Amino acid sequence: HMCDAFVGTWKLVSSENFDDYMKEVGVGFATRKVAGMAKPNMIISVNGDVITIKSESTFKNTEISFILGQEFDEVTADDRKVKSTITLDGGVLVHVQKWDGKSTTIKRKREDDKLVVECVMKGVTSTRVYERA
Numbered sequence: 001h002m003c004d005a006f007v008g009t010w011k012l013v014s015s016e017n018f019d020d021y022m023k024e025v026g027v028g029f030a031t032r033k034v035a036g037m038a039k040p041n042m043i044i045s046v047n048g049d050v051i052t053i054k055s056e057s058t059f060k061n062t063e064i065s066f067i068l069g070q071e072f073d074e075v076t077a078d079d080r081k082v083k084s085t086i087t088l089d090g091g092v093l094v095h096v097q098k099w100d101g102k103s104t105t106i107k108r109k110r111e112d113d114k115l116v117v118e119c120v121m122k123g124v125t126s127t128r129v130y131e132r133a
């Protein structure tokens with residue numbers, strides 16, 4: 001029942017500072033423009049200890065499955081090949097991606113009826129808000 005309040009189908013309804021976050025990550029112009037338009041659906045499910053997060057959008061469809069605390073390889077939507085570890089910290093899913101000596105952290109939390117996604121690269125944060133679909 002670890003992540004019960006995350007499970008479901010979620011739709012992106014607002015984004016702030018995502019272009020600057022993607023710049024800080026190293027995403028190139030064309031991908032930033034097209035990826036910034038997307039309004040993904042995020043589908044979260046749990047089966048035993050395995051959590052699956054799917055993102056479906058006009059830009060890219062992605063899917064990760066993982067066990068908390070157990071590192072896995074991830075190819076991100078912008079085509080980075082990263083090593084990811086996701087933990088639960090005080091009810092927040094904390095997702096750290098490592099690649100090429102760099103690191104970014106994505107935090108996912110429930111706030112009211114929203115799922116709030118905070119993406120941090122160095123000093124730059126983007127906040128992406130999802131609602132139930």
Ligand SMILES: NC(=O)c1cccn1Cc1ccccc1Cl
Nearest residue numbers: 022025027035076077078104119
């Ligand atoms: N994986 C990440 O660090 C991340 C955080 C928020 C979105 N993403 C993937 C992403 C999707 C489209 C374009 C650029 C990127 Cl960085």
